[PDB]
Ligand binder design. Sequence first.
Ligand SMILES: Nc1ncnc2c1ncn2[C@@H]1O[C@H](COP(=O)(O)O)[C@@H](O)[C@H]1O
Ligand SMILES: Nc1ncnc2c1ncn2[C@@H]1O[C@H](COP(=O)(O)O)[C@@H](O)[C@H]1O
Ligand code: NA
Ligand code: NA
Ligand code: NA
Lengths: 306, 303
Amino acid sequence: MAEKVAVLLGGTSAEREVSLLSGQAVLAGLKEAGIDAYGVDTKDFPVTQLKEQGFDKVFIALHGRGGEDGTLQGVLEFLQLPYTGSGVMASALTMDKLRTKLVWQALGLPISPYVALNRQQFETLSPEELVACVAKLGLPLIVKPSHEGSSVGMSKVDHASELQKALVEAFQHDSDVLIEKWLSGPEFTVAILGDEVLPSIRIQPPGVFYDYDAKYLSDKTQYFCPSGLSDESEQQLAALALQAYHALDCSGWGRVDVMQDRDGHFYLLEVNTSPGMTSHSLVPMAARQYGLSFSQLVARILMLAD
Amino acid sequence: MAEKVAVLLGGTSAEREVSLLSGQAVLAGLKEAGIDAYGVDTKDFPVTQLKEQGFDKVFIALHGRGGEDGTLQGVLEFLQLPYTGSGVMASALTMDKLRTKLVWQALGLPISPYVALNRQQFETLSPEELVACVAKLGLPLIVKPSHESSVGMSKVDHASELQKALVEAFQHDSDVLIEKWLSGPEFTVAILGDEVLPSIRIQPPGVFYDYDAKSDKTQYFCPSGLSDESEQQLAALALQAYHALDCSGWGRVDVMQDRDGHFYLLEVNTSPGMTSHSLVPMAARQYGLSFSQLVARILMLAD
Ligand SMILES: Nc1ncnc2c1ncn2[C@@H]1O[C@H](COP(=O)(O)O)[C@@H](O)[C@H]1O
Ligand SMILES: Nc1ncnc2c1ncn2[C@@H]1O[C@H](COP(=O)(O)O)[C@@H](O)[C@H]1O
Ligand code: NA
Ligand code: NA
Ligand code: NA
């Protein structure tokens, strides 16, 4: 019989409202393609019952916790249902910004100079020792929790005297914290669809961070596709992005986040393994510039689930 | 109302028979400690219904696929049931010999000199170019799939044997590793929470400690023969390796020495065997734990 496809949407993360909109858009595009798709709001329906309900394949339009972090991927693996996007390991690994950075560094891929600190060091070290620990990074600094957490707990530290309060804030959210040399920007994202690298997008957040307000709420964020990069720089960025995505064992689709420093060198930030899928979200924008309609995009993502 | 504990055992992986034994043992030990535990053969009972069935906490005594690789951990995270051993990421990461190696490498942890090949490379490059890729490693070499001790491993003694090995490895995975051969001896270090248990020296019948080994020629030595000072160095290295991969609860770290007596990290196993002939129970005996104490302490680390 024809495949019955579940579009997982909404859920219970902070990104619920955006996921409802992703899932709505995905459903309409699947419908336009003639795919027998059904919206499943996982706040109300347990994912562990999908095989029992008669689904054959899963389109993941969830964002954040319980959607893009390996938990859901593990449930679908247990159910033996094919599903979109990256597998368990890559989905979880991409949430862990420390271990993402370790993998990339071992491979020789570029990341901003940084220092990692765990809670037992933080409790053991004085403020002045903590300042000395990061002095090699210069000023300003970015301090963040190591794990992805809807953008929370990050600070830009302009003076050494401010480090302590930034560490206290970050350690409210995670027991590993990262202190990074500040990158000037600009910021970019590079969508990946199976083998294919899509046109980059330049991202201009309204504030210091491309955070939850910037990504999902504000109209002040600006995006540029094409990005403005030269052909030679676009080629270099594309190859870098694909290397970063493979480094983490990603598959199906995703997006790689990159920033430049003052001299134009690219640095890798992270990979998003369940990107927004509203009609004007990044991946649909990159895909339209590449030549795919929204419908074709979601059909392709789904064809890559096997 | 005492907590009701499921001991997940058997399942459907290649390791099912071993897992039945591990599970049987675990179940007996938990009950011996006063825990209200039940055996649950996951071949017959779906892990998705554990909460519906009234279970409060889970001891995972499954091995291999669907047991120690993150998939089960994802289901138990969804159900919000506390469980033994490492979480989703560490459980999955520890299956990937490549990305394990990369994490350890970036932290400055000791691993055998190696060269990683992806498939683009195998199929592009000619047999002579591939010999040349790994020249700097010398001889002899081990060739292995990045996932799965199972199939696909070779020992390569001359450059001319390499192609054959790369072909056997690439039947099984698209990241393949070529490493400098380490002389041994080989050791394993069980970790229980924060505590490192006494090391075990492992003498396999042949070249690999690999399943047939995990024969009845396989020999284990505990004490391992290391000095107190080396045991301390090993214990610290092992803990660092385990924490590097985000492991928790318990597990086993596999390490080898080289010709200069330095230790090199091999892998971390996140759901170890618990049979009468298994390594973690032997280390636990050596530390002065009963098997019942051992399993209760592992369960106590689940919350
Ligand atoms: N080292 C850095 N320097 C400047 N901006 C950063 C840095 N790290 C993160 N950001 C900003 O914070 C956002 C979220 O950080 P992250 O989740 O680490 O990518 C990025 O998309 C950037 O806008
Ligand atoms: N580089 C190496 N040199 C020597 N023996 C190895 C090497 N790598 C693996 N082995 C053997 O193969 C077994 C399984 O390897 P692994 O799956 O990488 O942990 C180990 O327990 C060792 O007995
Ligand atoms: Na992810
Ligand atoms: Na529109
Ligand atoms: Na594992």
